[PDB]
Amino acid sequence: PNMLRKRQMTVLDLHPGSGKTRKILPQIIKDAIQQRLRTAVLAPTRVVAAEMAEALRGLPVRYQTGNEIVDVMCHATLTHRLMSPNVPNYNLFVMDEAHFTDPASIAARGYIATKVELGEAAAIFMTATPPGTTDPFPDSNAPIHDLQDEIPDRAWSSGYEWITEYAGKTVWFVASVKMGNEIAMCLQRAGKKVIQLNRKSYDTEYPKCKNGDWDFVITTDISANFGASRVIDCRKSVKPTILEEGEGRVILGNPSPITSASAAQRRGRVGRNPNQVGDEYHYGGATSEDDSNLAHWTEAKIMLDNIHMPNGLVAQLYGPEREKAFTMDGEYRLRGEEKKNFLELLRTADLPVWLAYKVASNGIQYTDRKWCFDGPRTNAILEDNIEVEIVTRMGERKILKPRWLDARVYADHQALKWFKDFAAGK
């Protein structure tokens, strides 16, 4: 209850499997309402806000993704609102999964930390792996066998007997959906039942695990729980990376080492049941915290620079994250029409922050799509081995050749489809 008073930043380092959302969160919220604190409760991802709504039943809470003083929203709803000209004076912020390195999450932590430092609010960040984490092997409810193994990143014809011999359930984190599919098909040829949880997520696949009739779930990301007694972790992921070369570019790099926080979260899927001994975590490479060129640090700073504060001052990243990229505070601030264009490119067109910033900072209007087509011929986007063409709503056929390339807009067929609609003026 005391943690709720202004000027306190509390990190609840709760090791994986402690049920923070389900037990600890409701008590905090009950104490907040009791103390009449205007409270923002922040969820990172799709499911967590909903899991919060059930956890917080009976409590006067308002969900935003009449008289309630507690608001539940995604990390990103807060950040997008903060940048706009349209946010309550929260006395308390509670951020669940406060390790997420989505740019809007990083920016949200910076804003919150800044408000707490000013003595304007209190905050509680809940996560097993808080920012500044370096330990991939945190505590668990049951001991876990940590095993360094060579992990395949493609189909195998022989060897790797330990993978297929195992009798229990395995979650295998792979570096890419493509790689995941090769592996899944491999395992299926070996008689294993496999679920690929990527963006067939809440299709059949998400609650296809609850039936329990599977041997492996192959996934790239986010670490709801399953029946797993074993995790296989390639310990790599493909990350958007900024290349400062030309007029600048964002690439999706070859698979690179994950952070210790990510490794800990992956490992933390197992060892959760104090009556189940022998769970295993097999990992295939080192972690790294050297990731200053990840797009998200710069994108977080772009967002923070664009949140106006009262003291004329610029919010800063949360302390342990400040070192991830040093710029002069305010460097990325946009004003007037450029800022309006930037927000529209973010909220309507859903462009990545970096790309929205490049377009708006070059004085381009939201509705002017010429930049999608007037880049150098080296920038032509190719899909299934041919130049991508669109027909604009004006009746012109154009090759998609953007002035700035952000690989996230052509990462998958669906990303490229959305970007083509955008380029055409749909």
Side-chain angles (χ1 to χ4, degrees), residues 305-319:
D305 274 359
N306 279 290
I307 297 179
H308 179 41
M309 306 288 279
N311 59 0
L313 225 78
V314 182
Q316 291 181 73
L317 299 174
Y318 173 49

Side-chain angles (χ1 to χ4, degrees), residues 23 65 208 219 236 242 259 289 291 308 350 364 369:
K23 25 206 288 294
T65 205
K208 226 170 96 185
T219 187
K236 302 176 302 187
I242 292 178
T259 61
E289 304 309 317
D291 58 11
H308 179 41
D350 222 332
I364 305 177
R369 288 165 188 3

